Symmetry: C3
Subunit: 184 residues, 3 copies
């Protein structure tokens, strides 16, 4: 049972506020002890800080909810960890049997195809797409309009640049870049 107010810890904060209000929260209290135990969310885009704050807030008896825009479409057979500080932005689609772990950010219009696993505290940017059966490690970043082809795995702590297309399995962490626009 979600509370009527929500604390938002953390730009990215106002965006999370919009998602909270979309869900039906009546009031958002920004933060950046003895307070009432309203639902909490951590609006920090940075994976490492988000995890640290997650641990601290959880240890002080707060429920860290998921913020999921009403327009996000989630398959009934998908698994989204409950009360796990996951952000799911508008027009995200999560297909059959995909699994989203705690603290993940799925930003606007990202797509998680069937049977994917998105590792804890990963950040999937606007328009990024994961094809079927893709495994994204913990603490990964997939840049804007990036994509990962079917059946591929990306190791923990990796970065996929904006516009970049991952085409091979990567069992060691790394940084994988796309081609930048060139001035003519």
């Amino acid at each position: 049972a979600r509370t009527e107010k929500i604390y938002i810890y953390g730009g990215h904060g106002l965006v999370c506020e919009d998602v909270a209000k979309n869900m039906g929260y009546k009031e958002c209290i920004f933060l950046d002890s003895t307070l009432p135990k309203y639902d909490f969310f951590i609006a920090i885009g940075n994976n490492e800080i988000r995890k640290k704050i997650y641990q601290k807030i959880s240890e002080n008896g707060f429920k860290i909810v998921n913020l999921i825009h009403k327009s996000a479409l989630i398959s009934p057979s998908a698994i989204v960890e409950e009360n796990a500080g996951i952000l799911i932005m508008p027009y995200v689609v999560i297909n059959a049997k995909a699994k989203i772990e705690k603290g993940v950010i799925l930003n606007t219009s990202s797509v998680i195809e069937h049977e994917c696993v998105i590792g804890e505290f990963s950040h999937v940017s606007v328009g990024a797409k994961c094809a079927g059966n893709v495994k994204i490690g913990k603490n990964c970043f997939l840049g804007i309009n990036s994509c990962v082809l079917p059946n591929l795995s990306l190791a923990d702590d990796s970065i996929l640049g904006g516009g970049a297309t991952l085409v091979k399995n990567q069992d060691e962490k790394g940084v994988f870049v796309g081609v930048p626009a060139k001035r003519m």
Copy 2:
């Protein structure tokens, strides 16, 4: 008049099941003679097998319906062949006077701009975009996050790779690749 049950021939099957249930089908019967004539769909991503199975099922007196997610936006002046085994996934947009032929797959968040023609049994992957007046041949594949610029034609049986941008007319079949992410 759609039936209350649907046979799904064919991962991709559970995804089609989700679209069927979204439309209002109450039950999905997976297959991979004397059966009741419920609506049928072919959930095979592969263009060539889909066509073969399409022909066989049609010859046995079954109706092969289109599965179109309620969130797919289709212009009133667009033409989508009726009862033609077309899959239209969530958040697809099909603009004025565009034409979608039998057996096409339009995957999640793909966009078909005004006056396009998408040839029979083509596969338009997640996030792929066709600009205005684009002609996609039969049996083509457009990869994830790919796109085709305005007024271009792509010959039958061609492949456009993930992330790739088609910039010239192609009247002969071919394979057109994008740049892969590079490890730094």
Copy 3:
């Protein structure tokens, strides 16, 4: 108070008609003196002609409305100039504190992240994404599936090609191209 009919000045015209009807307009009158003063829209994709026609129509006492598809999601804290001939297509998302100026086109599934400024008479094509705090100059064109990374500015009168990813600030106008698909 929007009128029940709308004049559409200007392919792109039928698409604008669809958006007008989606909003609740009952009739669209195409044009390409003493007429009744129904709401007006300029359905010209070309930035320079759109501006000229905008000026002429405004000087003849017509209201040039915005056409905004019901599926476009606009943050309550975003600023969209009222009655400014702005087109906002289906599944566009405009996040907190972003600002959209007069005559802009935001085409299908484009995303304008928090705190962006999109300059007057710019054209953001299908699937193009602007990250947080991005400043797009007046009269710019961002091509299909293009994107601009966080905190960047693009000078007035610039062009970003289809599929291209802008990675650096650009305070002088230019043309910034992506990599085309290559035949194998």
